[PDB]
Design a protein around this ligand. Sequence first.
Ligand SMILES: CCCCCCCCCCCCCCCCCC(=O)OC[C@H](COP(=O)([O-])OCC(O)COP(=O)([O-])OC[C@@H](COC(=O)CCCCCCCCCCCCCCCCC)OC(=O)CCCCCCCCCCCCCCCCC)OC(=O)CCCCCCCCCCCCCCCCC
Ligand SMILES: CCCCCCCCCCCCCCCCCC(=O)OC[C@H](COP(=O)([O-])OC[C@H](O)COP(=O)([O-])OC[C@H](COC(=O)CCCCCCCCCCCCCCCCC)OC(=O)CCCCCCCCCCCCCCCCC)OC(=O)CCCCCCCCCCCCCCCCC
Ligand SMILES: CCCCCCCCCCCCCCCCCC(=O)OC[C@H](COP(=O)([O-])OCC[N+](C)(C)C)OC(=O)CCCCCCCCCCCCCCCCC
Ligand SMILES: CCCCCCCCCCCCCCCCCC(=O)OC[C@H](COP(=O)([O-])OCC[N+](C)(C)C)OC(=O)CCCCCCCCCCCCCCCCC
Ligand SMILES: CCCCCCCCCCCCCCCCCC(=O)OC[C@H](COP(=O)([O-])OCC[N+](C)(C)C)OC(=O)CCCCCCCCCCCCCCCCC
Lengths: 171, 331, 65, 120, 459, 31, 100, 63, 50
Amino acid sequence: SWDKDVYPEPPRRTPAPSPQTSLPNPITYLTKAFDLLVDRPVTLVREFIERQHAKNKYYYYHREFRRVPDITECHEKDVLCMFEAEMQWKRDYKVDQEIVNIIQERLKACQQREGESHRQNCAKELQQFTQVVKAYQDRYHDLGAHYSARKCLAKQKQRMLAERKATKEAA
Amino acid sequence: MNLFSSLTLVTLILLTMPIAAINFNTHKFTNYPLYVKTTISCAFITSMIPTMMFIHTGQEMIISNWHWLTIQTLKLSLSFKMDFFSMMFVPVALFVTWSIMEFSMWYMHSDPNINQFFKYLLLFLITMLILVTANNLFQLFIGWEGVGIMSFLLIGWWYGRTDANTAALQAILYNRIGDIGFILAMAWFLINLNTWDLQQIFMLNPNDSNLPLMGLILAATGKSAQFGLHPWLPSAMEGPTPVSALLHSSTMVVAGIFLLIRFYPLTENNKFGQSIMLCLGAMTTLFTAMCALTQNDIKKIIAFSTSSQLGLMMVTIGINQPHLAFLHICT
Amino acid sequence: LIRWTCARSANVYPNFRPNTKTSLLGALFGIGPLIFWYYVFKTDRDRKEKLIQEGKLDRTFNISY
Amino acid sequence: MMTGRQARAPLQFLPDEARSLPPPKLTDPRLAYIGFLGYCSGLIDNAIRRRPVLSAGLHRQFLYITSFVFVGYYLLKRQDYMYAVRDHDMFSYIKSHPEDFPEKDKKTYREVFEEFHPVR
Amino acid sequence: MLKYIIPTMMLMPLTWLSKNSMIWINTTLHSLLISLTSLLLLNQFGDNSLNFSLTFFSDSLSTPLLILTMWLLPLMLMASQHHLSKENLARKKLFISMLILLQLFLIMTFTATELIFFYIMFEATLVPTLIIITRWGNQTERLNAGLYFLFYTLAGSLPLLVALIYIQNTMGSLNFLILQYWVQPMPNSWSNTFMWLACMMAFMVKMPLYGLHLWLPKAHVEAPIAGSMVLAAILLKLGGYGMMRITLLLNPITDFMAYPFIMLSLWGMIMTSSICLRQTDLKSLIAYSSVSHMALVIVAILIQTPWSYMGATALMIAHGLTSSMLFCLANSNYERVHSRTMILARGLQTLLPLMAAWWLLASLTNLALPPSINLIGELFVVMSTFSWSNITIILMGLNMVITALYSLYMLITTQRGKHTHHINNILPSFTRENALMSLHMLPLLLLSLNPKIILGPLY
Amino acid sequence: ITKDMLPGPYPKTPEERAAAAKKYNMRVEDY
Amino acid sequence: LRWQEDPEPEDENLYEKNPDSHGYDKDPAVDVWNMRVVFFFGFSIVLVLGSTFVAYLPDYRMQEWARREAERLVKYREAHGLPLMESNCFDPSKIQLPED
Amino acid sequence: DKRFLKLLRFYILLTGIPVVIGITLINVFIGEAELAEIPEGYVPEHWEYFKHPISRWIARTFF
Amino acid sequence: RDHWIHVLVPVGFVFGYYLDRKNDEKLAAFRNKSLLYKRELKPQEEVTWK
Ligand SMILES: CCCCCCCCCCCCCCCCCC(=O)OC[C@H](COP(=O)([O-])OCC(O)COP(=O)([O-])OC[C@@H](COC(=O)CCCCCCCCCCCCCCCCC)OC(=O)CCCCCCCCCCCCCCCCC)OC(=O)CCCCCCCCCCCCCCCCC
Ligand SMILES: CCCCCCCCCCCCCCCCCC(=O)OC[C@H](COP(=O)([O-])OC[C@H](O)COP(=O)([O-])OC[C@H](COC(=O)CCCCCCCCCCCCCCCCC)OC(=O)CCCCCCCCCCCCCCCCC)OC(=O)CCCCCCCCCCCCCCCCC
Ligand SMILES: CCCCCCCCCCCCCCCCCC(=O)OC[C@H](COP(=O)([O-])OCC[N+](C)(C)C)OC(=O)CCCCCCCCCCCCCCCCC
Ligand SMILES: CCCCCCCCCCCCCCCCCC(=O)OC[C@H](COP(=O)([O-])OCC[N+](C)(C)C)OC(=O)CCCCCCCCCCCCCCCCC
Ligand SMILES: CCCCCCCCCCCCCCCCCC(=O)OC[C@H](COP(=O)([O-])OCC[N+](C)(C)C)OC(=O)CCCCCCCCCCCCCCCCC
């Protein structure tokens, strides 16, 4: 499984079967045939494989990267510090990419799960999507193919000068 | 969930199995056309179960089963969309294709490349069900170019004949002119909506959809043989009769109509695209039915017939009635 | 056939004479469309950059580039 | 450039202070390359006189390898010496003229303002 | 990278100490062993390049070019062993030596940490190529073609030498890893303008750029089959590799210097593809197709967006495989009709069905049939250039029509129609030739399953 | 194949025109 | 007349003297062993084990980690009420601006 | 053509079928790793950060 | 050896691989000194990598 908080799902409200007709639908018979002939042998083979997994347990780990000094507190043309700042920035850029991917998966799952009432019932995921796309655009857009922490810091300083001038001219 | 998605993927994998059989062969067959016909009859029987349990509840889903490639924010996955359109079109295409192949077991019986013929025809069916069950624009483009290339290989079947090779390259020419607009639409959706998946396209719901819908209308003009890009479909009768019956009447030629039906939430809010589709489909259904009044070759008459019906399908998309258009495809 | 394939490729430049007709057709068809598409793409990108830097062009979900 | 440096002691291939420097090892990759040049000279010498190129004159090929390794070892010693003299003069000159080599204020990028150029 | 340079150099004793009938089998075997060893370069990280030493490193741009380069040598040995069978044994060993030496220069051209060493290897690749073309080419015009190939590259690259030595004197280093962090923005001046031109025009010639591409329909055509394979598949891609390295140092001046050259490519791919519609020489048709495909790589590098670099390196690997296979197919018919006229031998599907299927697959990958990596690169470049300007799609889309038009005409002229009556020396396809076609096409179709390894350093 | 059966310059004398028509295997009045 | 020249040698057919020729060499034992070497070290070695090696690359350019790490960070900042991404890549407390 | 295709399928399957059988035997019997938190004081090796056994084998042996 | 020529290129790999390892110890100045991967040494361990 996964984590239900990073991939949110509302609980399933399925309606009860209330058949009015006297003709039996084939879906019940084919579901019973799929349960007997397919799901049980697949479950048996999976339990065999699961026992063979349990006969030797061993683990893999999620690699933690501790924080190193970023590009703002690295000296100019000091490659030993700004190299590590650049590697940290590139890993953060790839992780922010996958954050945008997670919010896109939330948006698409909400749209398909809500069906025709998607335009009302997925305003929250749309708001989260617009927020994270606006943040990713102000953080990483238009840096070019030779992007760096220097390019991103220069874009941030230009945006902060623009915000400061817009605040100053309106006060 | 366990029955629906399983038999959904079983249909497509079952259709891919005789391709592995014809590629992994050594011997002379015990009627490989009978094997492919039995496979497609079994695929129709298999695909009827998800269709019936869609008729029961309206049960739709998406099988995004295999992650393929993440271009920094674009997670292209092998994603099959089981909605109303796939659930209605896959059994109709399988039933028609099963009839076309039992026709072809008699019609193409004197052909010493009959196993190659049934191989190409099954490859067409695999690419078309990739097209109609697709969830993103890249997989739909795979099915799109696949039915274009199998149209090439099946128009130019008797390849020593110069006119068949000429009509096949003509069909490729008009289809790639439509593909200009298809790739234009893909480019617009990636640059302005960061997606090729249809769900994010529908949920973002863009308002400035003049240019991508112009691209999609150009793609449907090329693929469904509308006016300006029409003559490849009467030229396409130069292939064998079951090629014209399966590909060029009922199954391939409705793919541009299917493309504009698939984007109906973007056409039900754009009146300009509706007027363009309406005028273009009316022009096509006038012109092709007028050309059919005086023809003497029977395949040319039925080709202008099916292009006039495609023009009528474009008309009923253009009056913002997409489900009537898809019902008319299945009919 | 050998004579045709030699005439299409090898004998073109030894039987070329730069005169008025060849110069006008080579400068009209050679650097003509280069100038044309240059001014088209330059005007379009000046317009687009002016709309972007002034906050006019809708660049809302544009994060792939 | 350094003609006034090696003018107080002229025509010395390796001076005495060159012995302060570590000599190249016999497994120097440059010296192995010069031995390879000796082997190539031996093969070309057998090829130009229509001899079996690998077979004829193993004594001659071995003297080719030996002579090129022998000359190239002293050439590499003098090379390392002259680059060490170059660096010694550089460092003595920077130490003797501090006013021509000031210590620069290394500013971090929080103060350093670079103009941003968007690629779009 | 020294685990690859030393086996490639040990291929020289492996071909000069071999028995007279074993000099193809041994070199094929051990070059395939080196190509299997090449997969260790896929130790790529999302942040750091695979940095070996002060001299060699390999990022995710150089890694697929290296794997393609080390794969191309056994394929060239299989391709070139038939028509050099009546050759003298010493010249046969010299030909194998020139191929091995060219691979040796290429594998340390793509892994050059420092740019003047990149220049030395990049121009070292001329001399085995020049000797192969001007020595084992078939026709008279191999000498003139070698002259054009030599003197376009040197006239473009001797300003590149002065520009790189100027960067060494100004920045202090020509290490690429240092210049990732010591790059200064290049301001607007005439001095920086000719700095840009001197850094770029060598690679413009090697790609080739339209208007400067005149060496290529002579150098690729007058070469032998191994020469045409290595010229189309690798030696064009040195230009794209070098541009992707050197446009680090050319910002933000490229943002207004690229405007003519992009036009020269965006029009050039319309012209050269159109030239492919009227080429009677089939090998020249494949040559102008190579120009038309590398025009997109030039456009994508000059707009310098991430999608453009991903699509451009995918297009480089994909075009290397596809163009190498198309030259090998043209050779497979040249070894049966002894002419390169495309209209001469016709109807070859009636006689050679499986070889016609290899022609079919190479033509479908030539026209960028999805989901091939041809289409992945083509499509991603078209996406990035739609982001650049919304009108370029016209010049893209019409190209994707014309690229289809000659890709199937080549299939219809040669393989389809009525067979030529008087040509009766059309042998059945050898196992060697179909092995050559399959070793081109099966890696190309397997890379559609996992294309992330051929998408460059910014996947 | 030889040199005087390959295409050459533009014929300006009538005997060179006749040699050209003999080369291209067609009549001089048709050439 | 012109000089003393050998005439054009005719095109040889490998299938005449070796009807089982694979096209690698005119000696049949050398030809069949060349076929075995090409097919074993080309297909059995490089293609099959190459596809197995590329299929099981250890998280090629750390994308999978980058999903899992993002699945950590979102899980930290959904519950703690933080926004999912800041528009500032670096902390504005550690950036000095040119005064004007 | 048929001889080339029989040789092609044979020399592909000659190591393809052992690789498929071996990968199935790894996925059943050796089995796939489970994600765990890093213990305090434990420094994992670089090949212990990958999930499949063949990926761990490549990161331990070659990379 | 009857087949001594098939060990020129593999040993040329192995020896070459050796030289790569031989160069790694010449580039080991920041071993266990990077700000990201520095750590206390585990018992019975002298270097973090070789
Ligand atoms: C079979 C021979 C085939 C031919 C062989 C030769 C082929 C040619 C040469 C190939 C050379 C190798 C090339 C490189 C490949 C390297 C391997 C690799 O990359 O693997 C990747 C990938 C991952 O492998 P992995 O990383 O090792 O495993 C990851 C797991 O997390 C960890 O693994 P796990 O432990 O979770 O996995 C468990 C698995 C072991 O793991 C595997 O087997 C996985 C490895 C298989 C690799 C196969 C690769 C060969 C290619 C196969 C596909 C093409 C075949 C030919 C064409 C067929 C027609 C298309 O256990 C089983 O297999 C047992 C379950 C059996 C279920 C069925 C029977 C149940 C009822 C039995 C009733 C009777 C008993 C009742 C009582 C029982 C009491 C005890 O493996 C596969 O892709 C496996 C193939 C099946 C995938 C799904 C197929 C269906 C998909 C359908 C929807 C999508 C397509 C839609 C198409 C639409 C129209 C176009
Ligand atoms: C990692 C494990 C992977 C395992 C699975 C492998 C997946 C496939 C890989 C590539 C396969 C290529 C090999 C077949 C074609 C070349 C040889 C040939 O023609 O043989 C004919 C021969 C059978 O015909 P024949 O009657 O004997 O002689 C031919 C006639 O003379 C007259 O010939 P013909 O013209 O009548 O027949 C040729 C016909 C002609 O038909 C066509 O040309 C039409 C095809 C294009 C339109 C339809 C497809 C459009 C795209 C949709 C499919 C892709 C997406 C689907 C996914 C879902 C939606 C996203 O083509 C076919 O029948 C091939 C069917 C499959 C086509 C795949 C797409 C190729 C199109 C070009 C590129 C398109 C983009 C890239 C796609 C990459 C897919 C992996 O086949 C064989 O003998 C097969 C030998 C064994 C082949 C092994 C292939 C893999 C080798 C890799 C080794 C290392 C990895 C281990 C895995 C080993 C697996 C066994
Ligand atoms: C006849 C033989 C049949 C197979 C016999 C052996 C199996 C027997 C049956 C038991 C099942 C075995 C276990 C289950 C299989 C493995 C499950 C698993 O986790 O697999 C790992 C994964 C699952 O995906 P994933 O997300 O875990 O991994 C993707 C890898 N990353 C994340 C790095 C991107 O791969 C597969 O399952 C591979 C097979 C996929 C099936 C479809 C292939 C289609 C190929 C199309 C190519 C071109 C497409 C281009 C367009 C794409 C769309 C845009
Ligand atoms: C394949 C054929 C085409 C090849 C084209 C090759 C590129 C085209 C342009 C090349 C220009 C020459 C090299 C420039 C190197 C610049 C390095 C540099 O630092 O520049 C700044 C320097 C500036 O000097 P500086 O850098 O010392 O100045 C200090 C800085 N300021 C300016 C602030 C004081 O530029 C120059 O000094 C001159 C640059 C122009 C040189 C003009 C002479 C050559 C003319 C063109 C020849 C082109 C190829 C000829 C052959 C064609 C085929 C036969
Ligand atoms: C690389 C640059 C240079 C280029 C030249 C290279 C020359 C050297 C060549 C060496 C060998 C080849 C190297 C590249 C190998 C690429 C392949 C590879 O490894 O793939 C990994 C991919 C990995 O997929 P993945 O991305 O899901 O990875 C899953 C990751 N693991 C396994 C760890 C969980 O392998 C597969 O996808 C295998 C899936 C099963 C087999 C395939 C099933 C689908 C295929 C099509 C079947 C039919 C469909 C319908 C068709 C109907 C008719 C049209």
